[PDB]
Amino acid sequence: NNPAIKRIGNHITKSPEDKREYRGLELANGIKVLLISDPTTDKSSAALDVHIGSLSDPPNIAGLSHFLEHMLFLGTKKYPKENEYSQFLSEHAGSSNAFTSGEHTNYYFDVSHEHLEGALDRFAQFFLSPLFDESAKDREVNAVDSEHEKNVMNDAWRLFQLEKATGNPKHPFSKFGTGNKYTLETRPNQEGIDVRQELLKFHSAYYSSNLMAVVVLGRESLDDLTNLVVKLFSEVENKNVPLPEFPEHPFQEEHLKQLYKIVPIKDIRNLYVTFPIPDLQKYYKSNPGHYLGHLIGHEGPGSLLSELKSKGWVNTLVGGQKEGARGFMFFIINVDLTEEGLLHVEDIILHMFQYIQKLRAEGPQEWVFQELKDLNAVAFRFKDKERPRGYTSKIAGILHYYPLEEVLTAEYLLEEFRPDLIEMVLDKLRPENVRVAIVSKSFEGKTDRTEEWYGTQYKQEAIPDEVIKKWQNADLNGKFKLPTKNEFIPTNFEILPLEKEATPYPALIKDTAMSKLWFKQDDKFFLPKANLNFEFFSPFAYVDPLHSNMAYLYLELLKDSLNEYAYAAELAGLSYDLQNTIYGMYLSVKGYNDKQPILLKKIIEKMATFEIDEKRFEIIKEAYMRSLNNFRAEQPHQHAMYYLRLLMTEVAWTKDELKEALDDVTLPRLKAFIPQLLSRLHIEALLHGNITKQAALGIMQMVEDTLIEHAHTKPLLPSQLVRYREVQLPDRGWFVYQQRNEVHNNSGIEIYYQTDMQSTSENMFLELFAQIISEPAFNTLRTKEQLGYIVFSGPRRANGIQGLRFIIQSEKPPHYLESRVEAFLITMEKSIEDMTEEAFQKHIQALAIRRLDKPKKLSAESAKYWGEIISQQYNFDRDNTEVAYLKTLTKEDIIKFYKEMLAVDAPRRHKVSVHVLAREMDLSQAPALPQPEVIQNMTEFKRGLPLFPLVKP
Amino acid sequence: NNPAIKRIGNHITKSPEDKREYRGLELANGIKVLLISDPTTDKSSAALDVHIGSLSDPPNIAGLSHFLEHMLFLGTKKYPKENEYSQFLSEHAGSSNAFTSGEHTNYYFDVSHEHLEGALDRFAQFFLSPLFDESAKDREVNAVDSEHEKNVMNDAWRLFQLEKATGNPKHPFSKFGTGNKYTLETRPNQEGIDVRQELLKFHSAYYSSNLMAVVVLGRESLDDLTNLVVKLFSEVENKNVPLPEFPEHPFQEEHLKQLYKIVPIKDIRNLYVTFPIPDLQKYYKSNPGHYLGHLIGHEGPGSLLSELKSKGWVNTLVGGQKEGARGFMFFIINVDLTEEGLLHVEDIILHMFQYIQKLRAEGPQEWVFQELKDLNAVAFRFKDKERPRGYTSKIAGILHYYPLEEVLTAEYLLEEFRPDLIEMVLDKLRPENVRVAIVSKSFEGKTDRTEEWYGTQYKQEAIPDEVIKKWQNADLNGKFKLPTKNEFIPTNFEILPLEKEATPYPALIKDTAMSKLWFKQDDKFFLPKANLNFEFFSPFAYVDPLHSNMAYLYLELLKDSLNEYAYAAELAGLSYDLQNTIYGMYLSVKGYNDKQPILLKKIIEKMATFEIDEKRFEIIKEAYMRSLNNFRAEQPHQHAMYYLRLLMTEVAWTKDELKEALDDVTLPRLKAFIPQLLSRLHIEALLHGNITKQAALGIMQMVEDTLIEHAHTKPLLPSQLVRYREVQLPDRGWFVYQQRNEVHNNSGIEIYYQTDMQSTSENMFLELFAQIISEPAFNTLRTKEQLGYIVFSGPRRANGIQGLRFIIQSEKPPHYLESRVEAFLITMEKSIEDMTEEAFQKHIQALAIRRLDKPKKLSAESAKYWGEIISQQYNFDRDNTEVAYLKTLTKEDIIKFYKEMLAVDAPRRHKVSVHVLAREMDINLSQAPALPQPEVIQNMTEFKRGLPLFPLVKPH
């Protein structure tokens, strides 16, 4: 009967395993709404997607629509306290964020399930009466500018923008999305523009209800959720905005058959092939784009990649349709290049076109599509339950593209095989319709052009007709075949009955010198999946850098060879994850349990009888050489983190040590390393999912057996299994480590306040304090003081030791950042003594609801247990023990801990801080700091300090 | 002119390099005396040798003459305080000891150079009017029994006495020398003997002046020393005893052509061949024994051992004349056995006789004598200056055998080539008068006889005549040739001039990623010698037990191969020392610098290009397996020390880990290991002696180059050079680790009171406290309370950490030993409070004199520097800086240090204790305190993981 609701759907197609209940509806004002009722969820969540984005920016104020999203957080009329929103979520265990694509601005949050109304009310105000405080407009401009700065020296963004800047300049596609201080402050003032009223103009013009979609998820019933949404969102105004379309492709005849030579920041080698295609979105029911993506992109026997690999030209390939906007899309084929490949770019592309030609002459293959339809069907059927926040947000986005009833199935299920649309898209992938980009350091100095916003250095050339013609006549190659039938598709989805002696937590079911096995049969989610986790201990994996290098190379080489075989399985929802740890190797096998032991067996026996192709070896090594080199071009805040981790762990090899040892690793060498590595091992495993106790026992039995047989593996001695210790800093000591980031003209910092070993008391003391200061820290150091876009606080846990850490990336010097963080610390102490008891119990509550949050998918429960096993702490009931203890802490209890561990003159203050300097470098009252002791040598530092004990199991 | 001196002899011939001055004389009462005047010496010393020993023991009181030795320390008439002697020396930086051989009882001491007189007065009383207190006799008897107990399960001692008990029973040689509680207390009481007056009776009977020789070394002029000796020793009475001789060999015909099968304690395989020979001492100027010893014993090309080694029957051989007594000697050939060798013993002996026959057929070789004479001549000329204590003692013994003028030269210089005596001794080494003994675990249970004093079980057989005959007909073997000219004999002894930029301490003259070189040109001793020390760091030497095993096996194999070549040099006074450490490898080359770089070159070159003989590999491995196994039969106090060292070091593999890992070391796996080890290295070296800066650099570069060329060696990264840390025990913690020693029926204990990191202050605090308690600890825990023969206290230093340690091996349980040590510690706390201020400075001076003692030989100065280099401390002026600080400590400073670190309830007391239990186990004494409740260590690893680790020390 309700006049505020225009249409209800009430039959929302969902996964046959999905227990949550859904109702879709449309409001009077045209807002499309999905309501999700999950009576069990521990956190409620909601999101809104506006179908306007950076593409609709005014041309004279670049980045306006992005800037606007930053602003909506900083206060509304009903709730004018600048951080009232942010703080409510913090005090009730919530979190929020947003993003801005070409045609979307998307806002999401989650909150403790019983404060959904409060959170949603404050959230709905964003779309009704934002303040755009003149004072706040001035500040958060810096957050954006700092954000752009972060991206300036990032190769991925530089390319991203360069493409935009080489098509039609008149096209909205050419726009600079992010915006910076020049585009949003300096230049608008110069031109007499008033940005705050431009924000208001934009908001009032485009944030219309008919362009909005809303998803709300909670514990509340479907009917209650209805009224709640109607109450808060039916007031939103309907300016009835025409939805923008971009029918004219930004790439026109002048922009095709063009070549681009681009200088990277890192030492990387890439080739980018691009085809402008019509907008294929409306053909979603058949998805011709996805079909050709699957084939061109395939990595199996006889694939395009397989051969480019054989010729030693490429390592990786990515192909398929690339999102554009309403009216245009792209089809891309992108490979990375070897040294050799760089000199055979014309050849590589030829190979690309003869594969595309192979596709053309064979015609569309229905059985391939039919396969794709059926895999999706299964993947969708046994879908993992998603975290509320990402689920609502994602769905809010796609409500714009599908009728209410079809949103859950829409981007998963393929329905109609359409061979005509396929040949029509395949017809677009022609040389006369190609754009080619080559990214390589070897174009240094040989370029003549500069892209405005990022400074990117490139060169533009027309591709000679001799070359186009020679591509056009691409004859068939007998090295390219279509994929064979995928044999890894699961058939048995039987959920094994829950055993009698089954346990709530993982039980230790095998305990030998060779191996220690943890097992739990899945009792919560009941999907035909399993998680098989393995840690192989060998001291030889990290004994010295040369060995560390080989430990890495060996697994990389292994993965490479297996890839052809494993890719099929990967597509069939069964995948594996294998890389070396500082203790040996890690191996995870996740997905459908059906064909799981087949892959696992192949992995182990292949690692145990591995024989190395030397051509592969020389390439993987060189690629790794580069990979190590490139860390110098990572972000400053990542450098700080890296150095600290190096500073505070007992044994840790640096990039420079590794990169030197790597010009020393030979082929016959790495060959000697492997059997020696595998000769003595210990294996700790956690098998978890739809597996029975003796099924598990059987699996590890296979793992052991294949190792013993093929690699003569025998147990390590117990005294040989050593975990590393954390450096033990002295009472009242302060150490500073200084380095420069040669690439980014931004500075970084991590500040570390070591407390003591991890224990239920020391844990909750830290975790709670971190919680209380968490939001104020972000507000003070970023929102008010604007030190940078990146500001982080919270616990740090390593080697059984813990403490508080601050991370800031800033345009200001570090030496200054220190005083501000230490200036706040005092601000908190005063504000904590003032904060009321009821405010305090909110934070207790917040941490508690957050720590006790129940895993939604199998994989997440596995990670929780696996955390305890690798950590050697094996405390599976940690969350209940600790939260129970947490609830008994007094306000005083925290003050003591602080004025004893953290305060500028605590008796037990242990503080080391890492300063990473910008490319070019030499308010509340800040306290008087001691004269820090400057670290000149990382090793010498460690030698003159004690090491902590390891934690007790 | 003088009634107290009978003879001032003559000018005592000495090495021209010897700056010390000598006068010999005989006293009126017949004491032969040598006086040594060293105006530079830091410690003075004196010794007395009585030419009476265990051979002259009464038959009913075995071990009396040894026991008497023990007793003379415990008080005399002029100085009656039981430990007056012992204590005087400790307060004046001295030390003392004595020993009792078959025909000698020899007493020596050293003291601060300005208290020679005081020490010597107290010392001379031993020989005039000892007390032999009835109370002390009752106590110190336990010390002797404890001493014997120590030796009971020791195979070397067991063999020693088994020999004695298989010759003529009527002969004095058969006597039991050590004595124990049964022979010296129990049985004499049984038999109505009054032991105290048996001591007196013996002492007055045999400690006659005509049987004594005295050496005194001091700063005083020769004249000053003269009057002093005459003063103190002319009192000694001359009962003029005839000197005992033993003309009748204990091994008669009834004891020859005999075979002995002996069960060992550890797992060893040995063969002992013995020949009774006349006493050759008087032939010292020709020394036919040394000549035949030198040849039979040789290890060079064509040697007896070389062939026995090749046949895979033996690994090591020792031959030559063996001391017996006045009137008889032995000639022995002793080899260790392989598994195979044990089954070819009759063959091995034949080969021995085939070599002896070769010697007979070739006749005496003058050029060999000519060689031996020249090596000795050089060895004596460029002899290292000896520490006073061992020097006086040594000469006191040999004053009985040589004219005064020759005592210094007598045992070095050869004079007469005597082809007749050579041929005469060679005539005695014949099958018809041989004794053979085979020691092996395989005779276990197959024995029928028991040796009384040690319990040794053996079996005696006549050697079948078929076998004797077949040995007698030893034809020549063409694999045996005599040695050629020794090509390593030094000829260039020129002392290179002291360089312009030469330094008092070693300078760092090379500091590269590959190697760090410390160098000092010898500025003190000026002998044509040099010391080349190298530490090779590789993490792969100790990464795991298997690798440690290979690191060892590999160097052992290398040494084995080189041995044939290296032996030549070894005789030429140039030798090498090569062994694996927990950090990599250690290599030292010492001796005459002349042909030194040749040896070093060959070592490195073969080390880098090593090829392994597979037969050698498997044998050495077997021996190492055994060697590891046999640790279960070392002494309880060594077990204690071992466990502690295992407990307190961050990384340390145990024997069981090693021997488990060892059955997995295959020939292919090891051959792969070696190039891995040498691939990346860093080298810290100290070159020190008679070489120039540029000679040193050349040597060190030569080493690198040979490694780089032949083994493609590259530098380690600096962070790869890791030294290990010591465990950091908590405030007020007490941990106990308990183990049983399955072989020895004696128990052991080490108690470690960890203090803190090493520092100029923390060092001297410990060392001074240690000094003060040093002698009292020995007096209380042994002399008074008689807990055992072995009682040790003192500093303990590892990984830059230090603390006080007590080590006791005792008949009583360890849990009790703890109570007595803790009781002693309180005794010290009170006695430091009672002791006078001037008494306190006595100990400071004492420690100072001990720490500031100047090295007398090059090798000893090298050790001090090398100590600083491996320790990573590099503090070359340590002794002056640290002593300077010491002299400023007050009594309070120590009291505080005790109460805060050591006291029974010190706020910062860190105490770990190792309890090693005896074979079968779990009043009028000072008050033992009530102790805390220990946390018993059950797992060595679990223990270490739950504790912090100390920092490493800072250089400079």
Ligand SMILES: Cc1ccc(C(=O)NCc2cn([C@@H](CC(=O)NO)Cc3ccc4ccccc4c3)nn2)cc1
């Ligand atoms: C504790 C806390 C307090 C406030 C926030 C918060 O959402 N502040 C407003 C805001 C944040 N963001 C986001 C998304 C964006 O770039 N939009 O253009 C900025 C962002 C995202 C991730 C970060 C991670 C670490 C440190 C800073 C971050 C900032 N957008 N608006 C987030 C966390």
Ligand SMILES: [Zn+2]
């Ligand atoms: Zn942003």
Ligand SMILES: [Zn+2]
């Ligand atoms: Zn004795």
